[PDB]
Curated annotation (Swiss-Prot), chains A, B, C, D:
This is Transcription factor p65. Changing C20S: Abolishes sulfhydration and impairs interaction with RPS3. It comes from the Eukaryota. The chain holds residues 19 to 291 of 549 of the full protein. Ubiquitinated by MKRN2, leading to its proteasomal degradation. Degradation is required for termination of NF-kappa-B response. Polyubiquitinated via 'Lys-29'-linked ubiquitin; leading to lysosomal degradation. Phosphorylation at Ser-258 by RPS6KA4 and RPS6KA5 promotes its transactivation and transcriptional activities.
Length: 273, 273, 273, 273
DNA sequence: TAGCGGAAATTCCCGGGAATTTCCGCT
DNA sequence: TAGCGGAAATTCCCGGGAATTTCCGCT
């Protein structure tokens, strides 16, 4: 039998809370999970449907997957990992009680110690190679399931990894979102100053991406146009049709060239001169 | 000798009062307990009809029937449980004094201790499993009859559980019902704002469920769209066919993902653009 | 010399926090104090401008002004009252560190004891008459100033009382505020159903008040149109002009006939049939 | 003999560095200093010009000048205070090595103890009043000069206080400055949306202040209009005359009601409808 | 040099909104 | 009477946004 992540965790959005912060109920939202309803990381067990055990731990993002320092607070959680009995009912299993607790650099060494001192190494990585530098800005979920063979003897399935979950605090991995704009319409020739407010962004890695029917332009602005990483004053690019008859509505949104990530689309109609 | 439940306790309809509400507290009614006539939880002992004693305690409604924190107040009750000597000349015994006194979360920890300290564990469940989260909104009656073996010495019979009993106090148990709506018709494309008023609901656990001929959509709204748990402003979802000729009437209703419960259906016709 | 309250405290808005709640920095906002900038209770001293002392305490709302049970937490506060040296600079004195801490009924008797046991009776009321039933839903600020005569001898001025301050708990005295509306425009003839959501209100004492250029109408709705005190479905009244040429924007807001109180105004434009 | 402050320290500008921050030592400049001519806090002793010693400590900016928790780092400093022997052949003494090292809230309690343990109390304020709340964003320099009486024995002179010194990095006391604006002109009737970007500001304590010939209005915006404390979207207020013939240029700037501080003025011309 | 100043890396705190207790009408 | 039920009066809690510490560029 093998494990399958039918419901991946939301890669962006939530921010790793610290131990000091009076938080713990925090739960990793499902990939789908919308503002209306939130889904939760779910895995399916193909080839089995009886009693068993499931352990969830955190690992590095890069190929060398070592026990990540951050802990995993929540229900059935201890020493940084999740571990509860598997429900014999069906092969479907979802988790809504998974909270990520990022540790401080001071307690970085101590964190990694408990990992192996508690034997929380899912990929059995050499203690020599695991040591180095960790990216406390992103993590991965490691589903370690253990079922039973036809006879009833423990059967440890092959560990599976989920898509990386970044922390919503770093302007580079954080989620892009436009909050407000001074105007949502301009000449088809462009050149109209736009004051849009958004979330923390990298002025050396961000851009106003315009899209439409097989078309795509970009906002004009130098790094000096990004105010405190939350505001961008740019100029509207000229529309494909430098002389349209009627107004045309296109989609505007923030883009991050690094990981070619996009923000939520925003309606923007072009007006003829 | 075995114990048989003749009259199960009424499932729901009665909330779990606090110690402070004793002044206006009640007793557990019978299953088939009408209002004109009153019946109470009754059991039957077959294979013995002489001297003996009965112990009634409260356990969880889940598989691991652990000692429930709530207490069982009433005549012949003590330390959260009931216990007395049953008629040595009757095989059927009814109980019309049993009362459920829910404990406060603050005194919940000690409550479990008292359950163990007095050996109120009828299923001999390891204390290791008696520290997790308990469902303070449901309970099961555990009848522990002790007769006298064919010789004359005490003979504890196999414990018998009753049906789950839930109190109306529980927030997520309230019945779903739509009271009023601003409009009952909209474009087949959806997107029409709907102001519906209903009863107390969980903004983190509720949704506008649309149904029809092998079809089902959902209303669009964030938690911030639920006003004081009695009003929900949402957008109508796009019907199956995004371009119907004539109007189509579907069923709309509130749904609670937790227990997949539904409210009373409401007629809603879709209109072509 | 006499004391003058040039800056009364906001009668409604803030809610008395309990001792358990991790709050204390709470400060009574000035009567003016808007969302932008907040003013603070200020008093002017006419006939004096040198060194002195000022004590602020809480008293009953009704004529029999007795030491109110609630305490006054904040800077220079002890035993439930405020007392700091008066600043010789000028005759103006404002307080932004005044926080109200409401006590529980259990500690009601104990609260009143400390009042007189600490001799915090500003109006010297007979211990016999002060005892009775207290109102924990409203209080008054008692400014007890003590200056110096031309010679330099202590001069206790006449205590002054500030307007009542009710807790935003009870609707009749709570603050009125419209949260959301299905539409903000209708025919000049009126009759358009309006679904507005607001805060707790008295269905027997509330009304949708329309205002404009020397004009004022009212929403139409029976008590049965008020859903759980937070929603009101009413009909728009016919605007003064029964046939205007262009749209006219008027102000809409909730009104409470009891104390003729109003909520925040809301823009509403009338449209010709 | 008395001490006189010749050169007061600059109030704004410099910010309090913590123990961790080393590189930027810091040196309190004189209020009458410039880039071309750096001046520093200077005092003058009149009535003596021989041997002696000077002690400089930090006290609160409020009436009860208690020993401030912050330390005074720099040359000839120790235990939060400065102290050295001044030139026995000069009546004027300047200090260009004084630095303010703010302490952390965690070590704030002990800091006060150190102040007392070393008798760093120049105003002999009872330790009873040295436990309340502290404003660690403002401080006053307390010059404690000790000369030699006409005889030759030590003679402590009356302590002299300086003007306050505010922490530039302190949010509530930082410098106000408008960086960019979407438009600098609008109708004399007002109501034009303005997107202005500035530095860190308190959304609960900030306002767009308009001024002119014996006139002054204010921008309209709720706290929800302040984006990440660096952007404010407000509406232009109506000018003194709602129907002017020609354009009128007034001054616009940020204002902070707390300390009624202002930002650099900005030209803004009003245009007739 | 000595710093300034922007930005991450920790910690805190408040406005609400609810759930949790308690109290009291009303058959 | 016996209980429903509803409101109160208390207590919790979440989302944020901030603040506070610390870091490091850069000249």
């Amino acid at each position: 039998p093998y494990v399958e992540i039918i419901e991946q965790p939301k890669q962006r959005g939530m921010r790793f809370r610290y131990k000091c912060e009076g938080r713990s109920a925090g739960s990793i939202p499902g990939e789908r999970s919308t503002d209306t309803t939130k889904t939760h990381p779910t895995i399916k067990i193909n080839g089995y449907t009886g009693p068993g055990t499931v352990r969830i731990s955190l690992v590095t993002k890069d190929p060398p997957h070592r026990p990540h320092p951050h802990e995993l607070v929540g229900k059935d959680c201890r020493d940084g990992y999740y571990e509860a009995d598997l429900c014999p009912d069906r092969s479907i299993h979802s988790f809504q009680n998974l909270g990520i607790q990022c540790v401080k650099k001071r307690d970085l060494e101590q964190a990694i110690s408990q990992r192996i001192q508690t034997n929380n190494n899912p990929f059995h990585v050499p203690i020599e190679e695991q040591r180095g530098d960790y990216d406390l800005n992103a993590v991965r979920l490691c589903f370690q399931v253990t079922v039973r063979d036809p006879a009833g003897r423990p059967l440890l399935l092959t560990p599976v990894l989920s898509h990386p979950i970044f922390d919503n605090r770093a302007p580079n991995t954080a989620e892009l979102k436009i909050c407000r704009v001074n105007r949502n319409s301009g000449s088809c020739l462009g050149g109209d100053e736009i004051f849009l407010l958004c979330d923390k962004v990298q002025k050396e890695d961000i851009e106003v991406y315009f899209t439409g029917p097989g078309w795509e332009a970009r906002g004009s602005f130098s790094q000096a146009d990004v105010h405190r990483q939350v505001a961008i004053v740019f100029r509207t690019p000229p529309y494909a049709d430098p002389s349209l008859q009627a107004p045309v509505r296109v989609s505007m949104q923030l883009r991050r060239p690094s990981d070619r990530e996009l923000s939520e689309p925003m309606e923007f109609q072009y007006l003829p001169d």
